[PDB]
Swiss-Prot record:
Gene it is expressed from: SLC15A4
Subcellular location: Lysosome membrane; Endosome membrane; Early endosome membrane
Quaternary structure and interacting proteins, as annotated: Interacts with TASL; leading to TASL recruitment to endolysosome.
One Pfam match: PTR2
Organism: Homo sapiens
Name of the protein in its database record: Solute carrier family 15 member 4
Transport recorded as keyword: yes
List of residues that carry Phosphoserine: S217
Its membrane topology: Multi-pass membrane protein
Entry-linked InterPro entries: MFS_trans_sf, POT_fam, PTR2_symporter_CS
Entry GO MF terms: dipeptide transmembrane transporter activity; L-histidine transmembrane transporter activity; peptide:proton symporter activity; peptidoglycan transmembrane transporter activity
Transmembrane domains' residue ranges: 22-42, 49-69, 78-95, 99-119, 135-155, 163-183, 237-257, 269-287, 309-329, 363-383, 394-414, 439-459
Length: 464
């Protein structure tokens, strides 16, 4: 009965999210390749910088998207405006203009990502937190399904017809999402926030900050016009911030592992490797949702989101250790024979080893994801105040982007001449004379330290 009733609205929201994710992954799958192979052939550095700027704008727009959704507008209306801007920007690709289109697409996706999760989360808030947890599980499953569908269909229909349609496919998807969402609204009534006074909440926050400049906060605000709700929201946000601060290195390690696993698998369509992870997720989310959760319900072992994030961090560390061991074995084997292969239009030298040895580590990462990210989202919805859930989601996405940037900086920094772990990394391939195993071991050590710090912070937070 918990999932009955608004099932149609939940399915519509999941379909819209799937279409949005498919369009985004279609955009990001071969943007650099399309720009390089286009008649306006730029340099590799120029395309890389454009992609990095696009990703940074998408990461940065999420807090402002949540701010715009929370203030002077609703949630569904802000989603509609964001996806309209997304469609308008995406229409430019099949046709300075490129910069404007990238800006529009980035703003649209940043607002959509920041606003879709809180809306669907509050849509099922009628029942207990278990309904929200199941909704988040199916939300992540739909995201992965959309990723797989895009990364397959792009190549599936790219060969049949002209390549322009390859970029026209996401746009149509966006349009479809638009229509679906519109229809959903006609029967949504998913407890619309109707946020009008929430704008004042923002200025109240500033007033509280002024009260800081002019448990000190509680006693100071008791005398003034600072009714307990806003003070408790400020306290909750203050408690939340260190969690994200500790989670930033986790996102750094996550993105670095995502890049390095593909880079290593290249030496055993290039996007299919990434699909592997998603495929594993598509296999793991349902089974767990039907088996892992009930058993705890039988034993009363239901942990907090922080404990599940810690378990995910432990699985990440185990996967990093396994990847390091596999890289060491591959380096030991490769010092005797090499095999020349071609992927796309690039020649790579790979060791005489099967590709299935990547199955264990990937599997571990999958478990970590199904134990961590979703749980974090639940926390991102649970501890956040009811007034500014979208702002909290936007800040979380911004912190994830900052972690990704820190990971890229660390990857650049572990390539200095004094380090000596890699010298052919500047070249496209020939990672045979490199030391990626040491990089994996360093990532595992950093993950362990971050896990310990997060455990301490989680214990301190749960004590209060």
């Amino acid at each position: 009965g918990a999932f009955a009733g608004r099932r149609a609205a939940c399915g519509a929201v999941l379909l819209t999210e799937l279409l949005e994710r498919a369009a985004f992954y279609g955009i990001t799958s071969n943007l650099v390749l399309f720009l390089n192979g286009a008649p306006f052939c730029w340099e590799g550095a120029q395309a890389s910088e454009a992609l990095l700027l696009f990703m940074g704008l998408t990461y940065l727009g999420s807090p402002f998207g949540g701010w715009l959704a929370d203030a002077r507008l609703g949630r569904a209306r802000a989603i509609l405006l964001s996806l309209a801007l997304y469609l308008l920007g995406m229409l430019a690709f099949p046709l300075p203009a490129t910069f404007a289109g990238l800006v529009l697409v980035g703003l649209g996706v940043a607002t959509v990502k920041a606003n879709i999760t809180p809306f669907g989360a509050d849509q099922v808030k009628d029942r207990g937190p278990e309904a929200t947890r199941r909704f988040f599980n199916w939300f992540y499953w739909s995201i992965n399904l959309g990723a797989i569908l895009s990364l397959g269909g792009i190549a599936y229909i790219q060969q049949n017809v002209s390549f322009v349609t390859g970029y026209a496919i996401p746009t149509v998807c966006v349009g479809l999402a638009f229509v679906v969402f519109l229809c959903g609204q006609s029967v949504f009534i998913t407890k619309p926030p109707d946020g009008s006074a929430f704008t004042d909440m923002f200025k109240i926050l500033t007033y509280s900050c002024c009260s800081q400049k002019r448990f000190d906060s509680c006693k100071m605000s008791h005398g003034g016009p600072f009714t307990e709700e806003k003070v408790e929201d400020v306290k909750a946000l203050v408690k939340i911030v260190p969690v994200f601060l500790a989670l930033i290195p986790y996102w750094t390690v996550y993105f670095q592992m995502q890049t390095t696993y593909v880079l290593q698998s290249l030496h055993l369509p290039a996007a299919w490797l990434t699909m592997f992870d998603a495929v594993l997720i598509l296999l793991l989310i349902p089974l767990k949702d039907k088996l892992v959760d009930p058993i705890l319900r039988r034993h009363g072992l239901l942990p907090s989101s922080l404990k599940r994030i810690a378990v995910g961090m432990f699985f990440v560390m185990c996967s990093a250790f396994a990847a390091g061991i596999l890289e060491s074995k591959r380096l030991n084997l490769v010092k005797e024979k090499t095999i020349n292969q071609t992927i796309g239009n690039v020649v790579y030298h790979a060791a005489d080893l099967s590709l299935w040895w990547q199955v264990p580590q990937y599997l571990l990462i999958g478990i970590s994801e199904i134990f961590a990210s979703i749980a974090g989202l639940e926390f991102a919805y649970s501890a956040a105040p009811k007034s500014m859930q979208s702002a909290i989601m936007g800040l979380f996405f911004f912190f994830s982007g900052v972690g990704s940037f820190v990971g890229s900086g660390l990857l650049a920094l572990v390539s200095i001449k004094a380090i000596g772990w890699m010298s052919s990394h500047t070249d496209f391939g020939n990672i045979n004379g490199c030391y990626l195993n040491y990089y994996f071991f360093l990532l595992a050590a950093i993950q362990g330290a971050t896990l310990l710090l997060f455990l301490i912070i989680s214990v301190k937070y749960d004590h209060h």
